[PDB]
């Protein structure tokens, strides 16, 4: 409405993830920045999803979602997920759906990690629904997390501005 | 309880922010990874805070908080915020509290950005409270956001493993 840099930009750069929803013929994927962990034990996550997203419809329908973690190498698939709508986009995507362990929603095999979630809350704040999901299963690529921490060579993906992305430095600073 | 890499590590690396709470004598700061935007218009944020944090007490008391954005250069102050407890830590911190525009909670002048929040919800999920706040005012450093986007030279801070941190590459990938 009022040109200027919107206030949400102050939290950026933010990690970019993929959200998978539905199953079989209805299987969808969208990009999502607005994701965070909300509890350590039980493991619970949340994602802000606008009502207008096909992903919002599929999450409400089935009560499950998958957070797949993409690398910088699949930015093209990530961009499609973030720009096109609903399950027909998968026919432009370089992605392989594999079953998941506890949700019906599929996982993305190229993903660094897939986090399988059962929805336990849905609150409305402003123009998005915050979908809170209990992590009931997870898979990942061993090298991307080899020392029980994230391996920075794996090219974890972040978002700076609308069409611009970056990964992390490989230079680590120790706090103690 | 069961040694192994905990499931929350799969979302990492995550941005690290500071949370400011209370005012005057009660002014506190803690580190917080688990922060995300939940709405664009109105601008609304959320932060997962364990009940055991002094910050949890101060947020419930006053209903306000500030998300300050730290750079890699102040990792030492950030580590103190994330390791010590309650307002006495400020006497080890290289930080200058300045007033805020709409909350009573102060801002951190060295911060790349301070995001002034009025609490509008508090839900409990697992071992944390998710504090949802309406952004009612904000300030930032112009060079850190010079092109209306984040300036990567500013050294935005991220968290890889318990005591390890990194910033972003300055190398930008265009998605279109
Ligand atoms: C990097 C990036 C991050 C995004 N993050 C979110 C998000 O956090 N929440 C949201 O509702 N939409 C987000 N979007 C928008 C959706 O990904 C995009 O609108 C998508 O076309 C919706 O697809 P769908 O209708 O198939 O679900 C994002 C887009 C991009 C490119
Ligand atoms: C990098 C980092 C991130 C942190 N993130 C969070 C968080 O998201 N939520 C939380 O409750 N505690 C978090 N903590 C823990 C608090 O910052 C830490 O326990 C602090 O000592 C609590 O201080 P207080 O008791 O003065 O509030 C984090 C600590 C570090 C070092
Ligand atoms: O760019 C990130 C983004 C977040 C939420 C949206 O609704 C759309 C885009
Ligand atoms: O390391 C990040 C962190 C998040 C939540 C906590 O409660 C403690 C630490």
Curated annotation (Swiss-Prot), chains A, B:
Gene3D superfamilies: Electron Transport, Fmn-binding Protein, Chain A (2.30.110.10). Its cofactor is FMN. The keyword Flavoprotein applies. Signal peptide: none annotated. InterPro entries: Flavin_Rdtase-like_dom, Flavoredoxin, Split_barrel_FMN-bd. Keywords: Flavoprotein, FMN. One of its GO terms (molecular function) is FMN binding. The keyword tRNA-binding does not apply. Belongs to the flavoredoxin family. PANTHER family: FLAVOREDOXIN, FLAVOREDOXIN-RELATED-RELATED. This is Uncharacterized protein PH0856.
